[PDB]
């Protein structure tokens, strides 16, 4: 009881559709954002440009994270026979199932169906496994994805390198923070 295979199958397909669409939209919005950084740098407002590129870095990391989750949903669909057949969790699926349960509370603001995918996977493999996933006590959640959805501020050198590349591309004079470039 609780678990319904078709709820999981339908919602996995929906999650892929929604992620596939959000990646495109967010990629386009990053173009518009980078133009705005060049405008701030041209206006000599470098100290603000630094804080505006933190938004760009976070959206870029998020788009990369959405690509990883798209892949794990597509993997659970490809090997959906195993999910439905066994009662134990296979090794091949452990990364995917644990990561999707871990990610859902972070992403479910944007990708509402991802909550239902997580809830069904917890109904299948039990609530206790679901709790061990959400904290990564299960030690199986994908490390790169957890990095990409971290709440920490970007490294100062990443911010500076972003400004250097954007400034170069839009032919705007920029001089990077000497202290940060030295610390690197």
């Amino acid at each position: 009881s609780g678990f319904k295979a078709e709820r999981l199958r339908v919602n996995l397909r929906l999650v892929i559709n929604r992620l596939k669409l959000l990646e495109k939209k967010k990629t386009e919005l990053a173009q518009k954002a980078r133009k705005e950084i060049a405008d701030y740098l041209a206006a000599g407002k470098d100290e603000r440009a630094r804080i505006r590129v933190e938004h760009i870095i976070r959206e870029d990391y998020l788009v990369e994270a959405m690509e990883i989750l798209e892949l794990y949903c597509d993997l659970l669909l490809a090997r959906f026979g195993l999910i439905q057949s066994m009662k134990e969790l296979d090794s091949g699926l452990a990364e995917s199932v644990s990561t999707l349960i871990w990610a859902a509370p972070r992403l479910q603001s944007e990708v509402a169906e991802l909550k239902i995918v997580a809830d069904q996977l917890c109904a299948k493999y039990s609530k206790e496994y679901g709790k061990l996933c959400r904290t990564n006590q299960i030690g199986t959640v994908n490390d790169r994805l957890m990095h990409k959805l971290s709440v920490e501020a970007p490294p100062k050198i990443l911010v500076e390198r972003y400004l250097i590349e954007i400034a170069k591309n839009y032919n705007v004079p920029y001089e990077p923070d000497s202290v940060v470039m030295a610390e690197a």
């Binding site: 709820r7 339908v10 919602n11 397909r13 929906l14 169906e113």
Partner: peptide, 8 residues
Amino acid sequence: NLEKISAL
């Protein structure tokens, strides 16, 4: 909803 559309 999308689940119902999927079904239809």
